[PDB]
PDB file of C-alpha atoms and ligand atoms in Angstrom:
ATOM      1  CA  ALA A   4       0.000   0.000   0.000  1.00  0.00           C
ATOM      2  CA  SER A   5       1.323   3.416  -1.097  1.00  0.00           C
ATOM      3  CA  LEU A   6       1.276   6.925   0.433  1.00  0.00           C
ATOM      4  CA  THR A   7      -1.471   7.900  -2.025  1.00  0.00           C
ATOM      5  CA  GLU A   8      -3.552   4.874  -0.998  1.00  0.00           C
ATOM      6  CA  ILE A   9      -3.077   5.769   2.694  1.00  0.00           C
ATOM      7  CA  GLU A  10      -4.016   9.438   2.219  1.00  0.00           C
ATOM      8  CA  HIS A  11      -7.073   8.331   0.194  1.00  0.00           C
ATOM      9  CA  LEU A  12      -8.216   5.966   2.949  1.00  0.00           C
ATOM     10  CA  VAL A  13      -7.860   8.910   5.357  1.00  0.00           C
ATOM     11  CA  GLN A  14      -9.912  11.203   3.105  1.00  0.00           C
ATOM     12  CA  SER A  15     -12.522   8.479   2.505  1.00  0.00           C
ATOM     13  CA  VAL A  16     -12.956   7.843   6.247  1.00  0.00           C
ATOM     14  CA  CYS A  17     -13.177  11.529   7.120  1.00  0.00           C
ATOM     15  CA  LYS A  18     -15.713  12.092   4.294  1.00  0.00           C
ATOM     16  CA  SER A  19     -17.802   9.119   5.448  1.00  0.00           C
ATOM     17  CA  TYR A  20     -17.749  10.723   8.921  1.00  0.00           C
ATOM     18  CA  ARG A  21     -18.641  14.261   7.796  1.00  0.00           C
ATOM     19  CA  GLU A  22     -21.669  12.748   6.025  1.00  0.00           C
ATOM     20  CA  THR A  23     -22.976  10.698   8.981  1.00  0.00           C
ATOM     21  CA  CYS A  24     -21.935  12.632  12.109  1.00  0.00           C
ATOM     22  CA  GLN A  25     -25.536  13.580  13.002  1.00  0.00           C
ATOM     23  CA  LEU A  26     -24.639  16.621  15.111  1.00  0.00           C
ATOM     24  CA  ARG A  27     -22.447  19.386  13.665  1.00  0.00           C
ATOM     25  CA  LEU A  28     -19.618  20.311  16.051  1.00  0.00           C
ATOM     26  CA  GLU A  29     -20.129  24.050  15.436  1.00  0.00           C
ATOM     27  CA  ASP A  30     -23.830  23.786  16.424  1.00  0.00           C
ATOM     28  CA  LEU A  31     -22.925  21.895  19.637  1.00  0.00           C
ATOM     29  CA  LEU A  32     -20.243  24.424  20.620  1.00  0.00           C
ATOM     30  CA  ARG A  33     -22.557  27.388  19.975  1.00  0.00           C
ATOM     31  CA  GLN A  34     -25.355  25.716  21.960  1.00  0.00           C
ATOM     32  CA  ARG A  35     -23.127  25.584  25.081  1.00  0.00           C
ATOM     33  CA  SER A  36     -24.665  28.776  26.528  1.00  0.00           C
ATOM     34  CA  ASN A  37     -28.163  27.293  26.086  1.00  0.00           C
ATOM     35  CA  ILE A  38     -28.476  25.630  29.507  1.00  0.00           C
ATOM     36  CA  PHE A  39     -31.605  24.079  31.114  1.00  0.00           C
ATOM     37  CA  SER A  40     -33.203  26.117  33.926  1.00  0.00           C
ATOM     38  CA  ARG A  41     -34.115  24.701  37.368  1.00  0.00           C
ATOM     39  CA  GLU A  42     -37.790  24.255  36.435  1.00  0.00           C
ATOM     40  CA  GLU A  43     -36.943  22.393  33.224  1.00  0.00           C
ATOM     41  CA  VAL A  44     -34.569  20.148  35.197  1.00  0.00           C
ATOM     42  CA  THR A  45     -37.348  19.584  37.756  1.00  0.00           C
ATOM     43  CA  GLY A  46     -39.566  18.925  34.725  1.00  0.00           C
ATOM     44  CA  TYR A  47     -37.277  16.076  33.651  1.00  0.00           C
ATOM     45  CA  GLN A  48     -36.753  14.631  37.142  1.00  0.00           C
ATOM     46  CA  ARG A  49     -40.532  14.449  37.640  1.00  0.00           C
ATOM     47  CA  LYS A  50     -41.062  12.410  34.469  1.00  0.00           C
ATOM     48  CA  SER A  51     -41.805   8.703  34.684  1.00  0.00           C
ATOM     49  CA  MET A  52     -39.022   6.106  34.624  1.00  0.00           C
ATOM     50  CA  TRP A  53     -40.946   4.620  31.695  1.00  0.00           C
ATOM     51  CA  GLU A  54     -41.012   7.928  29.797  1.00  0.00           C
ATOM     52  CA  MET A  55     -37.317   8.759  30.293  1.00  0.00           C
ATOM     53  CA  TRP A  56     -36.307   5.299  29.032  1.00  0.00           C
ATOM     54  CA  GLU A  57     -38.649   5.718  26.043  1.00  0.00           C
ATOM     55  CA  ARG A  58     -37.030   9.082  25.214  1.00  0.00           C
ATOM     56  CA  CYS A  59     -33.449   7.841  25.735  1.00  0.00           C
ATOM     57  CA  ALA A  60     -33.920   4.569  23.793  1.00  0.00           C
ATOM     58  CA  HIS A  61     -35.287   6.597  20.877  1.00  0.00           C
ATOM     59  CA  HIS A  62     -32.301   8.986  20.729  1.00  0.00           C
ATOM     60  CA  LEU A  63     -29.999   5.962  20.944  1.00  0.00           C
ATOM     61  CA  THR A  64     -31.858   4.252  18.059  1.00  0.00           C
ATOM     62  CA  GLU A  65     -31.398   7.355  15.887  1.00  0.00           C
ATOM     63  CA  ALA A  66     -27.718   7.730  16.755  1.00  0.00           C
ATOM     64  CA  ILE A  67     -27.075   4.037  16.006  1.00  0.00           C
ATOM     65  CA  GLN A  68     -28.654   4.486  12.552  1.00  0.00           C
ATOM     66  CA  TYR A  69     -26.077   7.211  11.673  1.00  0.00           C
ATOM     67  CA  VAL A  70     -23.242   5.058  12.981  1.00  0.00           C
ATOM     68  CA  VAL A  71     -24.518   2.128  10.876  1.00  0.00           C
ATOM     69  CA  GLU A  72     -24.475   4.538   7.896  1.00  0.00           C
ATOM     70  CA  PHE A  73     -20.896   5.465   8.781  1.00  0.00           C
ATOM     71  CA  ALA A  74     -19.858   1.798   8.828  1.00  0.00           C
ATOM     72  CA  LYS A  75     -21.487   0.949   5.473  1.00  0.00           C
ATOM     73  CA  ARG A  76     -19.366   3.721   3.907  1.00  0.00           C
ATOM     74  CA  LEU A  77     -16.063   2.377   5.235  1.00  0.00           C
ATOM     75  CA  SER A  78     -14.070   0.613   2.512  1.00  0.00           C
ATOM     76  CA  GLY A  79     -14.546  -3.163   2.706  1.00  0.00           C
ATOM     77  CA  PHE A  80     -17.356  -3.301   5.298  1.00  0.00           C
ATOM     78  CA  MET A  81     -20.092  -3.890   2.692  1.00  0.00           C
ATOM     79  CA  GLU A  82     -17.888  -6.553   1.071  1.00  0.00           C
ATOM     80  CA  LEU A  83     -18.026  -8.585   4.297  1.00  0.00           C
ATOM     81  CA  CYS A  84     -20.812 -11.143   4.783  1.00  0.00           C
ATOM     82  CA  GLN A  85     -24.055 -10.163   6.578  1.00  0.00           C
ATOM     83  CA  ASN A  86     -23.000 -12.210   9.614  1.00  0.00           C
ATOM     84  CA  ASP A  87     -19.637 -10.436  10.013  1.00  0.00           C
ATOM     85  CA  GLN A  88     -21.189  -6.997   9.484  1.00  0.00           C
ATOM     86  CA  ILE A  89     -23.689  -7.662  12.278  1.00  0.00           C
ATOM     87  CA  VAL A  90     -20.917  -9.111  14.482  1.00  0.00           C
ATOM     88  CA  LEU A  91     -19.032  -5.804  14.153  1.00  0.00           C
ATOM     89  CA  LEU A  92     -22.119  -3.627  14.607  1.00  0.00           C
ATOM     90  CA  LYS A  93     -23.513  -5.655  17.557  1.00  0.00           C
ATOM     91  CA  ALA A  94     -21.465  -3.857  20.196  1.00  0.00           C
ATOM     92  CA  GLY A  95     -19.343  -1.673  17.865  1.00  0.00           C
ATOM     93  CA  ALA A  96     -22.119   0.711  16.792  1.00  0.00           C
ATOM     94  CA  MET A  97     -23.004   1.700  20.359  1.00  0.00           C
ATOM     95  CA  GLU A  98     -19.381   2.004  21.431  1.00  0.00           C
ATOM     96  CA  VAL A  99     -19.078   4.527  18.565  1.00  0.00           C
ATOM     97  CA  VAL A 100     -22.153   6.443  19.792  1.00  0.00           C
ATOM     98  CA  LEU A 101     -20.572   6.778  23.260  1.00  0.00           C
ATOM     99  CA  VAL A 102     -17.294   8.101  21.799  1.00  0.00           C
ATOM    100  CA  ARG A 103     -19.235  10.551  19.598  1.00  0.00           C
ATOM    101  CA  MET A 104     -20.969  11.902  22.740  1.00  0.00           C
ATOM    102  CA  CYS A 105     -17.795  13.618  23.982  1.00  0.00           C
ATOM    103  CA  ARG A 106     -18.484  16.199  21.258  1.00  0.00           C
ATOM    104  CA  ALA A 107     -21.800  17.056  22.962  1.00  0.00           C
ATOM    105  CA  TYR A 108     -20.127  17.183  26.389  1.00  0.00           C
ATOM    106  CA  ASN A 109     -18.961  20.405  28.058  1.00  0.00           C
ATOM    107  CA  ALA A 110     -16.185  19.817  30.608  1.00  0.00           C
ATOM    108  CA  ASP A 111     -16.316  23.355  32.054  1.00  0.00           C
ATOM    109  CA  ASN A 112     -19.750  22.894  33.685  1.00  0.00           C
ATOM    110  CA  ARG A 113     -19.978  19.054  33.314  1.00  0.00           C
ATOM    111  CA  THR A 114     -23.094  19.183  31.167  1.00  0.00           C
ATOM    112  CA  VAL A 115     -24.370  17.309  28.161  1.00  0.00           C
ATOM    113  CA  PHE A 116     -26.516  18.323  25.179  1.00  0.00           C
ATOM    114  CA  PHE A 117     -29.906  16.626  25.606  1.00  0.00           C
ATOM    115  CA  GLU A 118     -33.085  17.357  23.602  1.00  0.00           C
ATOM    116  CA  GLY A 119     -32.015  20.893  22.639  1.00  0.00           C
ATOM    117  CA  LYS A 120     -30.145  22.163  25.709  1.00  0.00           C
ATOM    118  CA  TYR A 121     -27.236  21.446  28.053  1.00  0.00           C
ATOM    119  CA  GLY A 122     -27.907  19.846  31.444  1.00  0.00           C
ATOM    120  CA  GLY A 123     -25.937  18.010  34.122  1.00  0.00           C
ATOM    121  CA  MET A 124     -26.210  14.515  35.595  1.00  0.00           C
ATOM    122  CA  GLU A 125     -29.347  15.337  37.655  1.00  0.00           C
ATOM    123  CA  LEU A 126     -31.451  15.628  34.495  1.00  0.00           C
ATOM    124  CA  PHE A 127     -31.555  11.836  34.340  1.00  0.00           C
ATOM    125  CA  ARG A 128     -32.664  11.029  37.899  1.00  0.00           C
ATOM    126  CA  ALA A 129     -35.962   9.429  36.765  1.00  0.00           C
ATOM    127  CA  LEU A 130     -34.087   6.638  34.914  1.00  0.00           C
ATOM    128  CA  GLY A 131     -32.911   5.274  38.291  1.00  0.00           C
ATOM    129  CA  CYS A 132     -29.457   4.347  36.969  1.00  0.00           C
ATOM    130  CA  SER A 133     -27.233   7.040  38.484  1.00  0.00           C
ATOM    131  CA  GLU A 134     -24.091   4.874  38.276  1.00  0.00           C
ATOM    132  CA  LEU A 135     -24.748   4.264  34.578  1.00  0.00           C
ATOM    133  CA  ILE A 136     -25.187   8.020  34.108  1.00  0.00           C
ATOM    134  CA  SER A 137     -22.004   8.665  36.138  1.00  0.00           C
ATOM    135  CA  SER A 138     -20.072   6.236  33.913  1.00  0.00           C
ATOM    136  CA  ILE A 139     -21.117   8.121  30.740  1.00  0.00           C
ATOM    137  CA  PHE A 140     -20.264  11.529  32.242  1.00  0.00           C
ATOM    138  CA  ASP A 141     -16.851  10.297  33.466  1.00  0.00           C
ATOM    139  CA  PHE A 142     -15.986   8.624  30.173  1.00  0.00           C
ATOM    140  CA  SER A 143     -17.003  11.797  28.299  1.00  0.00           C
ATOM    141  CA  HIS A 144     -14.989  13.952  30.728  1.00  0.00           C
ATOM    142  CA  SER A 145     -11.791  11.954  30.161  1.00  0.00           C
ATOM    143  CA  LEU A 146     -12.226  12.017  26.334  1.00  0.00           C
ATOM    144  CA  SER A 147     -12.849  15.779  26.302  1.00  0.00           C
ATOM    145  CA  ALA A 148      -9.419  16.397  27.899  1.00  0.00           C
ATOM    146  CA  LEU A 149      -7.853  15.001  24.682  1.00  0.00           C
ATOM    147  CA  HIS A 150      -9.479  17.673  22.514  1.00  0.00           C
ATOM    148  CA  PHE A 151     -10.196  15.179  19.694  1.00  0.00           C
ATOM    149  CA  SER A 152     -10.340  16.876  16.326  1.00  0.00           C
ATOM    150  CA  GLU A 153     -13.112  15.956  13.871  1.00  0.00           C
ATOM    151  CA  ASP A 154     -10.667  13.811  11.854  1.00  0.00           C
ATOM    152  CA  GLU A 155      -9.182  12.056  14.890  1.00  0.00           C
ATOM    153  CA  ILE A 156     -12.763  11.212  15.924  1.00  0.00           C
ATOM    154  CA  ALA A 157     -13.461   9.937  12.382  1.00  0.00           C
ATOM    155  CA  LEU A 158     -10.369   7.747  12.257  1.00  0.00           C
ATOM    156  CA  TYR A 159     -10.620   6.511  15.821  1.00  0.00           C
ATOM    157  CA  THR A 160     -14.327   5.543  15.436  1.00  0.00           C
ATOM    158  CA  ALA A 161     -13.548   3.672  12.209  1.00  0.00           C
ATOM    159  CA  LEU A 162     -11.122   1.570  14.286  1.00  0.00           C
ATOM    160  CA  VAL A 163     -13.772   0.986  16.985  1.00  0.00           C
ATOM    161  CA  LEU A 164     -16.032  -0.614  14.327  1.00  0.00           C
ATOM    162  CA  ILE A 165     -13.389  -2.344  12.204  1.00  0.00           C
ATOM    163  CA  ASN A 166     -11.837  -4.681  14.754  1.00  0.00           C
ATOM    164  CA  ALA A 167     -10.937  -8.342  14.263  1.00  0.00           C
ATOM    165  CA  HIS A 168     -11.118  -9.242  17.959  1.00  0.00           C
ATOM    166  CA  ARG A 169     -14.884  -9.749  18.109  1.00  0.00           C
ATOM    167  CA  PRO A 170     -16.821 -12.992  18.866  1.00  0.00           C
ATOM    168  CA  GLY A 171     -17.798 -15.299  15.992  1.00  0.00           C
ATOM    169  CA  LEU A 172     -16.232 -13.566  12.981  1.00  0.00           C
ATOM    170  CA  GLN A 173     -16.006 -15.577   9.748  1.00  0.00           C
ATOM    171  CA  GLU A 174     -13.879 -13.541   7.305  1.00  0.00           C
ATOM    172  CA  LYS A 175     -11.612 -12.816  10.282  1.00  0.00           C
ATOM    173  CA  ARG A 176      -8.494 -12.622   8.107  1.00  0.00           C
ATOM    174  CA  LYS A 177     -10.181 -10.005   5.890  1.00  0.00           C
ATOM    175  CA  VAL A 178     -11.271  -7.866   8.860  1.00  0.00           C
ATOM    176  CA  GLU A 179      -7.655  -7.991  10.156  1.00  0.00           C
ATOM    177  CA  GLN A 180      -6.520  -6.522   6.830  1.00  0.00           C
ATOM    178  CA  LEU A 181      -9.211  -3.792   6.916  1.00  0.00           C
ATOM    179  CA  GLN A 182      -8.216  -3.004  10.521  1.00  0.00           C
ATOM    180  CA  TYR A 183      -4.536  -2.963   9.496  1.00  0.00           C
ATOM    181  CA  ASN A 184      -5.122  -0.459   6.646  1.00  0.00           C
ATOM    182  CA  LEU A 185      -7.067   1.982   8.855  1.00  0.00           C
ATOM    183  CA  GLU A 186      -4.385   1.690  11.547  1.00  0.00           C
ATOM    184  CA  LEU A 187      -1.824   2.872   8.949  1.00  0.00           C
ATOM    185  CA  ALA A 188      -4.150   5.731   8.055  1.00  0.00           C
ATOM    186  CA  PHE A 189      -4.704   6.839  11.663  1.00  0.00           C
ATOM    187  CA  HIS A 190      -0.981   6.692  12.464  1.00  0.00           C
ATOM    188  CA  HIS A 191       0.028   8.492   9.249  1.00  0.00           C
ATOM    189  CA  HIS A 192      -2.454  11.250   9.933  1.00  0.00           C
ATOM    190  CA  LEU A 193      -1.374  11.638  13.536  1.00  0.00           C
ATOM    191  CA  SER A 194       2.310  12.057  12.629  1.00  0.00           C
ATOM    192  CA  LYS A 195       1.413  14.556   9.860  1.00  0.00           C
ATOM    193  CA  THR A 196      -0.519  16.661  12.429  1.00  0.00           C
ATOM    194  CA  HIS A 197       2.150  16.001  15.116  1.00  0.00           C
ATOM    195  CA  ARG A 198      -0.585  14.398  17.257  1.00  0.00           C
ATOM    196  CA  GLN A 199       1.004  10.978  17.952  1.00  0.00           C
ATOM    197  CA  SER A 200       0.893  11.813  21.675  1.00  0.00           C
ATOM    198  CA  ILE A 201      -2.813  10.811  21.925  1.00  0.00           C
ATOM    199  CA  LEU A 202      -2.087   7.138  21.086  1.00  0.00           C
ATOM    200  CA  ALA A 203      -0.956   6.275  24.634  1.00  0.00           C
ATOM    201  CA  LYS A 204      -3.848   8.360  26.002  1.00  0.00           C
ATOM    202  CA  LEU A 205      -6.680   6.596  24.172  1.00  0.00           C
ATOM    203  CA  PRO A 206      -9.194   4.838  26.471  1.00  0.00           C
ATOM    204  CA  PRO A 207      -8.321   1.148  26.971  1.00  0.00           C
ATOM    205  CA  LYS A 208     -10.286  -0.772  24.321  1.00  0.00           C
ATOM    206  CA  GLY A 209     -11.995  -2.976  26.929  1.00  0.00           C
ATOM    207  CA  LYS A 210     -13.153   0.035  28.970  1.00  0.00           C
ATOM    208  CA  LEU A 211     -15.400   1.186  26.122  1.00  0.00           C
ATOM    209  CA  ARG A 212     -16.513  -2.461  25.707  1.00  0.00           C
ATOM    210  CA  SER A 213     -17.533  -3.008  29.336  1.00  0.00           C
ATOM    211  CA  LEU A 214     -19.274   0.385  29.392  1.00  0.00           C
ATOM    212  CA  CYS A 215     -21.260  -0.463  26.272  1.00  0.00           C
ATOM    213  CA  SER A 216     -22.200  -3.926  27.639  1.00  0.00           C
ATOM    214  CA  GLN A 217     -23.444  -2.651  31.008  1.00  0.00           C
ATOM    215  CA  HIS A 218     -25.556  -0.001  29.253  1.00  0.00           C
ATOM    216  CA  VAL A 219     -26.976  -2.570  26.798  1.00  0.00           C
ATOM    217  CA  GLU A 220     -27.759  -4.906  29.738  1.00  0.00           C
ATOM    218  CA  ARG A 221     -29.792  -2.196  31.472  1.00  0.00           C
ATOM    219  CA  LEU A 222     -31.362  -1.019  28.199  1.00  0.00           C
ATOM    220  CA  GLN A 223     -32.765  -4.508  27.588  1.00  0.00           C
ATOM    221  CA  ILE A 224     -33.829  -4.834  31.237  1.00  0.00           C
ATOM    222  CA  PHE A 225     -36.452  -2.147  30.540  1.00  0.00           C
ATOM    223  CA  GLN A 226     -38.054  -4.626  28.115  1.00  0.00           C
ATOM    224  CA  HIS A 227     -36.817  -2.762  25.036  1.00  0.00           C
ATOM    225  CA  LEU A 228     -34.671  -4.828  22.608  1.00  0.00           C
ATOM    226  CA  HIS A 229     -30.986  -5.158  21.680  1.00  0.00           C
ATOM    227  CA  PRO A 230     -30.015  -2.211  19.410  1.00  0.00           C
ATOM    228  CA  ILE A 231     -28.736  -4.715  16.800  1.00  0.00           C
ATOM    229  CA  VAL A 232     -32.219  -6.245  16.447  1.00  0.00           C
ATOM    230  CA  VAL A 233     -33.861  -2.811  16.123  1.00  0.00           C
ATOM    231  CA  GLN A 234     -31.365  -1.712  13.464  1.00  0.00           C
ATOM    232  CA  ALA A 235     -32.042  -4.875  11.427  1.00  0.00           C
ATOM    233  CA  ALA A 236     -35.574  -3.524  10.852  1.00  0.00           C
ATOM    234  CA  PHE A 237     -34.122  -0.827   8.559  1.00  0.00           C
TER     235      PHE A 237
HETATM  236  O1  LIG B 301     -29.475  11.708  23.837  1.00  0.00           O
HETATM  237  S1  LIG B 301     -29.351  10.607  24.786  1.00  0.00           S
HETATM  238  O2  LIG B 301     -30.595  10.131  25.377  1.00  0.00           O
HETATM  239  C1  LIG B 301     -28.283  11.132  26.111  1.00  0.00           C
HETATM  240  C2  LIG B 301     -28.275  10.442  27.336  1.00  0.00           C
HETATM  241  C3  LIG B 301     -27.425  10.852  28.371  1.00  0.00           C
HETATM  242  C4  LIG B 301     -26.591  11.961  28.187  1.00  0.00           C
HETATM  243  C5  LIG B 301     -26.604  12.652  26.970  1.00  0.00           C
HETATM  244  C6  LIG B 301     -27.447  12.245  25.932  1.00  0.00           C
HETATM  245  N1  LIG B 301     -28.467   9.352  24.109  1.00  0.00           N
HETATM  246  C7  LIG B 301     -27.296   9.861  23.371  1.00  0.00           C
HETATM  247  C8  LIG B 301     -27.264   9.331  21.928  1.00  0.00           C
HETATM  248  F1  LIG B 301     -26.108   9.744  21.348  1.00  0.00           F
HETATM  249  F2  LIG B 301     -27.328   7.973  21.923  1.00  0.00           F
HETATM  250  F3  LIG B 301     -28.314   9.835  21.232  1.00  0.00           F
HETATM  251  C9  LIG B 301     -28.324   8.233  24.982  1.00  0.00           C
HETATM  252  C10 LIG B 301     -29.458   7.495  25.344  1.00  0.00           C
HETATM  253  C11 LIG B 301     -29.357   6.410  26.219  1.00  0.00           C
HETATM  254  C12 LIG B 301     -28.116   6.014  26.745  1.00  0.00           C
HETATM  255  C13 LIG B 301     -28.006   4.833  27.729  1.00  0.00           C
HETATM  256  O3  LIG B 301     -26.637   4.520  27.996  1.00  0.00           O
HETATM  257  C14 LIG B 301     -28.666   3.508  27.271  1.00  0.00           C
HETATM  258  F4  LIG B 301     -28.713   2.659  28.331  1.00  0.00           F
HETATM  259  F5  LIG B 301     -29.924   3.700  26.803  1.00  0.00           F
HETATM  260  F6  LIG B 301     -27.917   2.935  26.297  1.00  0.00           F
HETATM  261  C15 LIG B 301     -28.661   5.311  29.054  1.00  0.00           C
HETATM  262  F7  LIG B 301     -30.015   5.419  28.916  1.00  0.00           F
HETATM  263  F8  LIG B 301     -28.382   4.450  30.063  1.00  0.00           F
HETATM  264  F9  LIG B 301     -28.157   6.523  29.397  1.00  0.00           F
HETATM  265  C16 LIG B 301     -26.977   6.756  26.391  1.00  0.00           C
HETATM  266  C17 LIG B 301     -27.078   7.851  25.515  1.00  0.00           C
END
């Protein structure tokens, strides 16, 4: 693989991102002054457990759709069999959503963009999963300190999806080669931007995994349905 091939894979991944990112970074940054008032917060805390889980599962569904669209536009992914695609999307898609959320997270006041405004942890009291909420906030806080650029996000989330160490893969050799090529791309682009320093600072791969799993566990506990099943409907 040549320099031109590597730079093209970079441009193709970043383009696929830019087209599927759902929320424009500029919009999210500008919306940072648009903070929920006490009464609105109280308005959310008073809502039913059932309602809050309905709202949250719906936003998650939408976000997963965009991430699935991202994946389909990564070179090679479509060329994999339906089984291997779904194997990669099963946990991978939701792991990507949780990384993407650091863009909608403001470290200065520890708030998150939710349904049009920024609000802190207390917004989600009705859900009755404070430790799950804490885990998201703390993961998003640690990622924000890295100041991910749009392209770093793009490249890093491609690697989250395209990973050969996932249960029950068939064309495992071919996913290893797709993972290899995107690793070259990510590394090349980091050196070019003198941003190699983030490599050691990236969240341990199994931290994002165990976070995703615990959230999926609790999501299904509220009688919903695994996100992979829902996504299959489209
Ligand atoms: O917009 S969300 O509802 C959101 C929740 C918490 C903080 C900010 C934003 N949504 C974000 C998404 F990007 F997916 F749209 C979201 C919904 C639900 C979750 C959950 O992790 C779970 F369990 F449903 F997967 C939880 F409900 F627990 F928070 C996480 C994020």
